[PDB]
Amino acid sequence: KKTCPVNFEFMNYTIITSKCKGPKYPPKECCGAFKDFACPYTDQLNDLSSDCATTMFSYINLYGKYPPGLFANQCKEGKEGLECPAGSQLPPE
Ligand SMILES: *[C@@H]1O[C@H](CO[C@@H]2O[C@@H](C)[C@@H](O)[C@@H](O)[C@@H]2O)[C@@H](O)[C@H](O[C@@H]2O[C@@H](C)[C@@H](O)[C@@H](O)[C@@H]2O)[C@H]1NC(C)=O
């Protein structure tokens, strides 16, 4: 895979961690915070030849102590699925 040009390692994850707290993670609030964090990067996340998506999820889950697939599962439970409000789709993994 190509090296993701977005520096996920050093981004600010507080929009997610402040709104999405466990162990009873609120599904709608968690999905919304994840979309708010990740939807600006659909261009890079949806580059299937890059490691952007796997890198992003690795840091979300590391910094927030979240189970892998949590946000993918929660958003797929929601009315909008993994769709960003501007129309693009976030990858599940
Ligand atoms: C990351 O952003 C933090 C602010 O996030 C916003 O405000 C909070 C209250 C919440 O609403 C969130 O959704 C918003 O995006 C910011 O506070 C934090 O900075 C760190 O803490 C502050 C108090 C300073 O000490 C600063 O030096 C710290 O870095 C941001 N974190 C980083 C690592 O930049």
Swiss-Prot record:
The entry's localization annotation reads: Cell membrane
User: What domain of life is recorded for the organism?
Assistant: Eukaryota
| Keyword S-adenosyl-L-methionine annotated | no
Tissue expression pattern: Expressed in pollen, pollen tubes, sporophytic pistil tissues, in the early stages of female gametophyte development, and in unfertilized, mature ovules. Expressed in roots, lateral roots, shoots, cotyledons, petioles, developing leaves and anther filaments.
Choose any GO biological process term that the UniProt entry carries and state it. positive regulation of growth
Q: Which residues are sugar-modified?
A: 12
Q: What happens when the gene is disrupted?
A: Retarded growth, collapsed root hairs, defective trichomes, abnormal accumulation of high levels of anthocyanin and overall reduced plant size. No aborted seed phenotype and normal production of seed sets.
| Membrane topology of the entry | Lipid-anchor; GPI-anchor
Q: Name one GO cellular component term.
A: plastid
Q: Which UniProt keywords apply?
A: Cell membrane, Glycoprotein, GPI-anchor, Lipoprotein, Membrane, Signal
Q: Fill in the subunit field for this protein.
A: Interacts with FER.
Quote the function comment for this protein: Component of the FER-regulated Rho GTPase signaling complex. Acts as a chaperone and coreceptor for FER. Required for localization of FER to the plasma membrane.
| Protein name, per record | GPI-anchored protein LLG1
Tell me which species this is from: Arabidopsis thaliana
Q: What is the lineage of its organism?
A: Eukaryota, Viridiplantae, Streptophyta, Embryophyta, Tracheophyta
The shown range, given as first to last of full length, is 46 to 138 of 168
